[PDB]
Write a protein that holds these residues in place. Structure first.
Motif, short mmCIF file in Angstrom:
data_model
loop_
_atom_site.label_atom_id
_atom_site.label_comp_id
_atom_site.label_asym_id
_atom_site.label_seq_id
_atom_site.Cartn_x
_atom_site.Cartn_y
_atom_site.Cartn_z
N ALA A 65 77.66 -25.81 61.10
CA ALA A 65 76.40 -25.17 61.44
C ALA A 65 76.10 -24.08 60.42
O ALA A 65 76.95 -23.24 60.14
N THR A 66 74.88 -24.10 59.88
CA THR A 66 74.51 -23.22 58.78
C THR A 66 73.27 -22.37 59.06
O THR A 66 73.00 -21.44 58.30
N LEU A 67 72.52 -22.65 60.12
CA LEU A 67 71.33 -21.86 60.43
C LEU A 67 71.77 -20.45 60.81
O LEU A 67 72.32 -20.23 61.89
N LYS A 68 71.52 -19.49 59.92
CA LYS A 68 71.96 -18.12 60.12
C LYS A 68 70.84 -17.16 60.51
O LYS A 68 71.13 -16.07 61.00
N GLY A 69 69.58 -17.53 60.31
CA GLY A 69 68.50 -16.68 60.75
C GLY A 69 67.15 -17.21 60.30
O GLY A 69 67.05 -18.29 59.71
N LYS A 70 66.13 -16.43 60.60
CA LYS A 70 64.75 -16.71 60.21
C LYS A 70 64.23 -15.55 59.38
O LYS A 70 64.66 -14.41 59.56
N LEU A 71 63.30 -15.84 58.48
CA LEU A 71 62.69 -14.79 57.68
C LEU A 71 61.24 -15.17 57.41
O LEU A 71 60.93 -16.33 57.13
N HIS A 72 60.37 -14.18 57.54
CA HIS A 72 58.94 -14.43 57.62
C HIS A 72 58.36 -14.79 56.26
O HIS A 72 58.90 -14.43 55.21
N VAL A 73 57.25 -15.51 56.29
CA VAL A 73 56.53 -15.93 55.09
C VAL A 73 55.30 -15.04 54.96
O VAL A 73 54.50 -14.97 55.90
N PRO A 74 55.12 -14.33 53.84
CA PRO A 74 53.97 -13.44 53.72
C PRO A 74 52.77 -14.15 53.11
O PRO A 74 52.83 -15.32 52.73
#
Lengths: 50, 49
Positions: B2-11
């Motif tokens: 499992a590699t999904l470590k987080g989310k980060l927004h797109v500006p």
């Protein structure tokens, strides 16, 4: 109008046909002539010649 | 694994606003019996609807 050389008179009478290539009103541009029915002075409209 | 470590927004997303748009030079309209003849001189490719 005549012309006289050395006794002989030469007279070029009227041409048998009075045709001319230029119409009543023409346009000169860039050393070339155009048969164009341009508007008379003061009557020119937007977006066209004159 | 499992590699999904987080989310980060797109500006810089699309947003609503006002943009300046040109006006083509007004038509020249002439009238006749049940007829309207309009002369048009586009400055750019313009729609007539």
């Amino acid at each position: 109008t005549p012309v006289n050389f050395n006794g002989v008179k030469i007279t070029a009478g009227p041409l048998s046909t009075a045709w001319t290539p230029f119409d009543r009103k023409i346009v000169q541009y860039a050393g070339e002539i155009y048969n164009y029915d341009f508007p008379e002075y003061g009557a020119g409209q937007p977006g066209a010649f004159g | 694994g499992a590699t999904l470590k987080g989310k980060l927004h797109v500006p810089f997303l699309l947003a609503d606003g006002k943009c300046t748009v040109p006006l083509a030079p007004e038509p020249m309209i002439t009238f006749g019996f049940r007829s309207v003849s309009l002369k048009l001189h586009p400055k750019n490719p313009t729609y007539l609807i």
